[PDB]
Design a protein around this nucleic acid. Structure first.
Lengths: 164, 123, 60, 142
RNA sequence: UUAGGGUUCGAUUCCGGAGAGGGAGCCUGAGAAAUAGCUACCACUUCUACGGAGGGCAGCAGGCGCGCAAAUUGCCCAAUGUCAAAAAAAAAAGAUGAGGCAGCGAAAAGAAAUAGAGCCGACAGUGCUUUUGCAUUGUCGUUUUCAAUGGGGGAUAUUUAAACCCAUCCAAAAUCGAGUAACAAUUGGAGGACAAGUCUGGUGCCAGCACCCGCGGUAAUUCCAGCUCCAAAAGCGUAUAUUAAUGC
């Protein structure tokens, strides 16, 4: 017996999957950003809902409450990192204005293309997985790696690369 | 051809353990342009020159951890003072990679079976 | 009638299907549809564009 | 209505405990007569030995003949009917063959145009009957 | 599982209690009413030249039975602990199916391959237009062409107690390999609820489909086949229970 390692789901399917409204706004993403399947669109959704739950709960509180103070700075800090929000943001209402694209946008697959190192998102997903990209000096072969605001300006190529 | 591959060995955090008369040093390796993993022989040579040990006998190393992407390795190794201290203090398997270990004990199962039958006998 | 079972599935014609080239897979598949329906068009479905349409023939 | 008093608690509790016995969605859980009644013992499936093939009619708005199987249950020694749920697979069931049996859909009401039958035959001799239907496997007589 | 209030589960890794075929009695010990300790009875059960003598897996494997239902008679004390008169080593390394490791393992959970790009032709949309014509974007296609990489192969090796898995690599002087990328994705659906057929053949209240509403009586958008398209995707259907849906 005697396993003390956690399991958790990171993705879940929204209720009523045959809504033609939802289908539109799925394909629109998965085609454009070159995503493999719908599973990816959902994976980000979950983590965003999570973040937005605590932010809502903090916002409710009166000023000068410990929950508000401490954990408010943290939520904000980690949206400054990854470039989801800028450093002119502080409210914890900005945090609730985050939506699904702004996450996907900062995945390595898109960041590679946008920085000029590929000709398509589909093409940049290959460039990742053929082990010919880096994220500063560290070879990353995962397209779902979220890239820091600092470290999207040091992408370069792998040192194992015939293209570098 | 266009280069000569080399193996670079460094260390980070070092101890002096006078209780067991050994050194405990977290190794690092880099090995730019080297093909595949670094064999431990090379590492022992570099460490010899570094800590001014006259032996690769006293240098006995275990474990190596190859980080993802490119040639990189990190590890940990032990130097001992004397060669007698090495043989005595160190585990069997570590030694036997140098070829200073002991011959393997006879199979566990045959021992059990016999150890049971010895309880029966009176002499 | 205890046995007359399988009546229809005896009589029917079998083409036994037809050869086809392999399809795109992974992202490539999802790409394929998102081009067809939502691009090179004035419309997005909706029901405004119909994803499948068929030719005429017979009417009753 | 209800009581809003501070010490009103016990009257509320006892009221609920009475009125849940007017729910059939309470009884179906808590009462073991329901469990006993169910021919699987409330288990997911059970196996049985085929007795006889029984031709079964249909109700008035849709006239058809339906192929059904009188099966006996190993577990409890009860008899039951079940439907063959593929086209022309009456063949692949034969007498005295072991067979599995499942429920189908709503399990408190009988399915339309087959009265008394909530039971469909999934597997014959642990082979998938669907697999025989849409050919992959062939039935063992081995 | 639930916005909240709640609803439901707990045999099972940790803690507490109880039990060792069913019962009772007892010795020893600081501690036991111990069961791989003892005594007796009962239900079973194994040997015996039949005078007698034994057995207790709800310990690990494994076998029989059972049921819808569940792994190897594998390797190791290197690690983690425990017991001991005991550190290791000295000729000279205690024991442990506790425990670790591997095998089997689509219960469950994380990541991710099955292609990507430039030329030519065809189609659609938008802008300008002398209506000739041009530009931009997207799709499809040929004996079209170009690179790159994993699955897989191997090792100067490395991991590990030993060996694997992962990782790193195809020379550092010297070491493999895709083009139909045959290294070819499936499981359920297309009348309504509910995303997708004004199809074509076959059947004709028969065969069957259908959770429910309903389809089939020769004019089938639902059956039986083919093509076409849709949803999810290395996962997808089916059954039963339970929770949400339920302010039923």
């Amino acid at each position: 017996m005697r396993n003390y390692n956690n399991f958790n789901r990171v993705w879940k399917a929204p209720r009523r999957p045959f809504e033609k409204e939802r289908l539109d706004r799925e394909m629109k993403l998965c085609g454009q950003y070159g995503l493999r399947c719908k599973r990816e669109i959902w994976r980000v959704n979950m983590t965003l809902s999570k973040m937005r739950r605590t932010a809502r709960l903090l916002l409710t509180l009166p000023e000068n409450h410990p929950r508000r103070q401490l954990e408010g700075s943290a939520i904000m800090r980690r949206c400054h990192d990854y470039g989801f929000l800028e450093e002119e943001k502080d409210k914890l209402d900005y945090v609730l204005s985050l939506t699904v694209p702004d996450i996907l946008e900062r995945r390595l697959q898109t960041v590679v293309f946008k920085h000029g190192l590929a000709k398509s998102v589909h093409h940049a997903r290959v460039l990742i997985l053929q082990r010919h990209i880096a994220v500063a000096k560290q070879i990353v072969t995962i397209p779902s790696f979220i890239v820091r605001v600092s470290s999207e300006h040091h992408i370069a190529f792998a040192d194992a690369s015939p293209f570098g | 051809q266009k280069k000569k591959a080399e193996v670079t060995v460094r260390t980070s955090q070092f101890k002096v353990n006078k209780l067991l008369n050994r050194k405990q040093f977290i190794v690092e390796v880099n090995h730019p342009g080297w093909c595949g993993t670094v064999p431990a022989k090379l590492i022992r040579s570099r460490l010899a020159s570094l800590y001014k040990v006259a032996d690769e006998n006293q240098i006995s190393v275990f474990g190596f951890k190859t980080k993802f992407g490119g040639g990189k390795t990190t590890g940990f190794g032990l130097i001992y003072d004397d060669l007698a201290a090495l043989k005595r203090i160190e585990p069997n398997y570590r030694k036997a990679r140098l070829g200073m270990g002991k011959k393997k004990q006879p199979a566990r199962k045959s021992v059990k079976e016999r150890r049971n039958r010895n309880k029966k006998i009176r002499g | 009638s205890l046995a007359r079972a399988g009546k229809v599935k005896n009589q029917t014609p079998k083409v036994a299907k037809q050869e086809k080239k392999k399809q795109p897979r992974g992202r490539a598949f999802k790409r394929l549809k998102y081009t067809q329906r939502y691009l090179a068009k004035t419309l997005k479905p909706g029901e405004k564009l119909h994803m499948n349409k068929q030719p005429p023939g017979k009417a009753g | 209505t209800k009581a809003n008093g501070q010490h009103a608690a016990r009257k509320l509790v006892r009221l609920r405990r009475k009125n849940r016995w007017a729910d059939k969605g309470w009884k179906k859980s808590h009462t073991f007569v329901a469990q006993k009644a169910n021919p699987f013992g409330g288990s997911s499936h059970a196996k049985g030995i085929v007795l006889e093939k029984i031709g079964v009619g249909a109700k008035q708005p849709n006239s058809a003949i339906r192929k059904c199987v009188r099966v006996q249950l190993i577990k409890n020694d009860k008899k039951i009917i079940a439907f063959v749920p593929n086209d022309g697979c009456l063949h692949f069931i034969e007498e005295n063959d072991e067979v599995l049996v499942s429920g189908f859909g709503r399990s408190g009401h009988a399915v339309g145009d087959i009265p008394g039958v909530r039971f469909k035959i999934v597997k014959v001799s642990n082979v998938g009957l669907y697999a025989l239907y849409r050919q992959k496997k062939e039935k063992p007589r081995n």
